[model samples]
Target: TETQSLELAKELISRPSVTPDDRDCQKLLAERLHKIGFAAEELHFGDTKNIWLRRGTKAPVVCFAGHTDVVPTGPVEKWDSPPFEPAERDGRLYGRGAADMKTSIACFVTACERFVAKHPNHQGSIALLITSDEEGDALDGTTKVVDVLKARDELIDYCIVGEPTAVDKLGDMIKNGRRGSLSGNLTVKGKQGHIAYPHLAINPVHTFAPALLELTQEVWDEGNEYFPPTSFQISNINGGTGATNVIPGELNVKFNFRFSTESTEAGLKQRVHAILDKHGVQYDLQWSCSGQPFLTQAGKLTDVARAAIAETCGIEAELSTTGGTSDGRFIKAIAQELIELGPSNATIHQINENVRLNDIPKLSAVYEGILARLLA
Candidate 1:
């Protein structure tokens, strides 16, 4: 069983499916899924390729969601082996999407195979919602498929996203929720003039300095038990010309907020507006929200997942709401319960990424156990 999982993972890594490109990765998966009595349908939105696979038509759908896309390998020459070529050495499998995702997808398929083999008359349905747009713009990814599912009244009861969440070991941690992400693009208006005439020129940078400080120092909220405090960060600021002798007409600032459930999107925006207005700064601001904060409480899904992890890995898994946003945010709308569980994320999106070969079977068993508890 472990060998089958490893082979499937190798086959997936062999393809250079960089963001938004399936590169036939889903085709291989669909073929294997078809053999297991699953009906596979390709959902193509823009350049992104997505697949929706289901085995039963009953209620209480248990969905395993992940992406086929991997981030770009920075420099090919820097890797120990080709990023697209799966290499095995020292009990680890190295490849571009080895740890971040591909391996989890493989494990899911194998787990489904074994589970179905044992209980051919399982209750409810087993589903796989995969996309090739998670690492890119995410415009035509899980969210789009979720919309389609909602339109047809296909409700997912439980969903587990295959995002690398463990920091030290497999099954050590699982993300039950994610913080909301909101970004702001601000332009502070000013009059451009010669640097020599300081009295005549209005420097937008200088005008926005105090406001920026206040914004950063502001304490949005003290997060509750499952999350950390809402954090604000300035990612980029540009307000200068090549020549040092001119005062730039405008100062552009890009900032983002990773907010917990304690803070609402509307409240954060209102607070920011008040701060800038109080400082009497003339600015143009644009707000974009990628995901809203969500938490899955202690329920049947979380309880079953924890028990499965403990049984398979012999370690108690801790629930978390940290890390960047995931497709779980979008799936949360249709799922009564959502959690992210996968392999260790120590090497995700890095050079020479890899996963422990031994842990592959354990992960597959855990997934199988979850299916047994939920669907069987």
Candidate 2:
């Protein structure tokens, strides 16, 4: 029933576990999982809290992955109800993490409860990998847990990350993979001069414009069946001194690439160099990659999840790889197959974030159905 899931979600929402802080969210989860035979191990790294809880010692590990902490609730006064209170209004539950997603966590827990009660002895191992730093730098959350598993030679075969992916309705879409993300910090160099002296002044912004134009117009690659085309976008650019009378000596540009499997980090970097060199511009560039492209093919995990969604929610899931990165990138190192599913993402991270009340049990049923198919 939605009652169990709703109550659990409300409890989680009541505690304001903002980014990189647990505020005892995992502790609440730990207590419930303990009742269902999951032994917990608290993995605390820096200020982040993570839980590695498992049941059974067997093959074909199936992991439920998610984050406890949510984005900060913006301006409390602007909200219809207190962001931490988990208000129910007009057939929906409203709160900061309601959609993005404390409800998903609650659904997962209730699903586990029902699944274990029915099938006390299942086919494979079950584990929960919950972290509190995904909404922040993501350095000490899933990545740290993954490293610990790697060092111990433990691997997972399947994973389901509870990130809200449904667009208009529950289970309408699912994230099968994610594109690689690479960001650049660039400084175009030129000698500063008075605005009045056109012949003597070299504008760094002027030199960078043509190259930027070429980059935007160029097609990096035609993405394959699973991903969209690689894209480059400039997020921030500043060059001029506050005074209109002066030309700044250097132009700073911050850009990012959402690339497909057809693209490589090295290939992108080299192409950038070629473009800048062709323009004959003096520049210093720095690059940082947060995640590489990862995909789970249409195999056992996909087949079972699709069937479960169809059976539970009565909608066929549209497979996709277009979305911001999630903790799945870290789990991809060990889990052979992984996908993301949850409720509607319409109000995630918004001032009055909420989730449809009816979808709570439906989400739990979908998860339970998947567990039944995979583990039973």
Candidate 3:
């Protein structure tokens, strides 16, 4: 398995199929999948290329989803090897997609190859949803495929998004859920004048500081049994004119919130209004809402994935609801059971981003083990 996964992984990492560009990566995969009794349909939307490859027909079409696209390699000279050249040093594979998931596609390819070879008429279907747009604007990737699935009323029982969710050891932490994110931009009104004319001018920062302090300190929620308390952070603040004598006209403050189930967008807005009013600060607030909180109640899909982790890695995963939003947000629109699983996240989206060379086979084994338990 180690040699199999490494050979395939090295082939994929050499593609340099960066996000927003297919680089014909799907074509290479389709050939291999086709050889193994799987039929593939290529989906192209805008510049994004995707492949929906499948084998078998039964109750649950278990889908393993991942992205072949990688982010750009900035300052290629900094890399020990050329950016697109797949190189291995000290048991680590150093290349663009080694960590943020071309390795995952390689693993899935072999797993499906082995599974379909033996269980030609397995009780359930196995599929892969691979796209070339994961590292960029994802409007055309899995989101579009999901829409097509909905239009056909074809449901996927479970989707394992191969994002690097493990925090310590491989499969040690699974992302059962993610917190909701909201961003806000605020501009507060104030009088403008010279510092010598204090009675005629107002400083917006001074007027808004008290309200901001109160707003930032408020307990948005105690969180639920599975989440941490909601957090509010003012990411940016600016005020005053370049001239030291000017009071400036406004205070611009931008912040974001990572909230939990105990609160809604409405509740946060209401609290902000009250805090501003009590502080006598006249302000205009603009808000943008991202995904809302989603959690899998302990049930079928969760239980299966949990058991897989325990059996494969010897660690019982602690259910979590704290990462940022993912394609899981879009997939949930159809109301499917989704659980995130992948190798340990000790290195992702960084220089020399690589997974443990020993982890390739072990992680692939874990995925196949899950399929055996759930589908075989």
lDDT of each: 0.93, 0.92, 0.80
TM-score of each: 0.94, 0.96, 0.95
Error of 1 at 238 (Å): 2.8
For model 3, state the Cα shift of residue 28 in Å: 1.8
- For residues 266-326, write the lDDT of model 1, one tens digit per residue: 9999999999999889999999998899999878998899999999999999999998989
Give the poorly placed runs of model 3, Cα more than 4 Å off.
none
Candidate 2 lDDT, 124-160, residue by residue in tens:
8899999998888988889999999989978998899
Candidates 1 and 3 compared: the better one by lDDT is 1
**How many times do residue backbones clash in model 3?**
0
lDDT of 3 at 214: 89
Model 1: clashing residue pairs?
A: none
> lDDT for model 3, on a 0 to 1 scale?
0.80
Q: Enumerate residue pairs that collide in model 3.
A: none
